[PDB]
Amino acid sequence: GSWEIDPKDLTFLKELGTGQFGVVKYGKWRGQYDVAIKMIKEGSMSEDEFIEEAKVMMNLSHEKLVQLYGVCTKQRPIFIITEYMANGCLLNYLREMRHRFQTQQLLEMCKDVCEAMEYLESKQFLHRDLAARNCLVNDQGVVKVSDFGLSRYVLDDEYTSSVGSKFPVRWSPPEVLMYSKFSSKSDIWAFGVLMWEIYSLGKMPYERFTNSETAEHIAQGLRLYRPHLASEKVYTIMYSCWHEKADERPTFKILLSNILDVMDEES
């Protein structure tokens, strides 16, 4: 099928990482094209459901989304083939103090993510785990959104629900923590936290709190506060993502307009 890549077309060149979901390698497709090859650990994913969804995911083409090129499903482990992003994970990139980022660079990263999310919003597609650890950085410093929708197919019980140890509590609005109500507005909340991660150079949100303490904090109506590098206008944008009432939170189209306005003011 159009979603199926011949694994014989891959040349494996370097290891990019190993973890719970499997092993990621850098390689070439048909000798010429850079790819990331994700080798899925058996039992970690609902593979048939993922393969069906891969057909939809591949039609999601936007310059700020990490592209899904196809899957290799005729051997074990299956492979997922994606765009290669030379500078790796955004969270680690933010934490490398050598870059000495300007705030204009940080705002540009927020805009890259927002553009990807406005596109997903326009397609009624939820990310469901938006956070700096799920964004990647290419050789030009462009940030792109990765692993969109993947959490629906992860089998690990600690990651599946608000009670689990791996659940992204610190990126979740009160209605997710209390009621499991996911919507565009839970992606909005997570985006505001991602903006906070960017302007905090990769600090853990609510860094002094446990997950349980964070959930209590949020339930009481309290919030993150302003990163030192965020201007008042930037803080207003991120804070708007955290209204207790989900329907009072902006859309990604509004956030993008807000971010572009601040870019103009701060250039």
Ligand SMILES: CN(c1ncnc2[nH]ccc12)[C@@H]1CCCN(C(=O)CNc2cc(Cl)cc(Cl)c2)C1
């Ligand atoms: C180092 N690195 C990259 N470096 C350059 N270009 C890349 N393209 C894609 C990834 C990438 C990633 C940094 C974050 C962690 N990571 C993942 O891919 C995480 N997601 C995942 C999903 C599935 Cl389904 C299976 C598996 Cl094993 C992993 C590798």
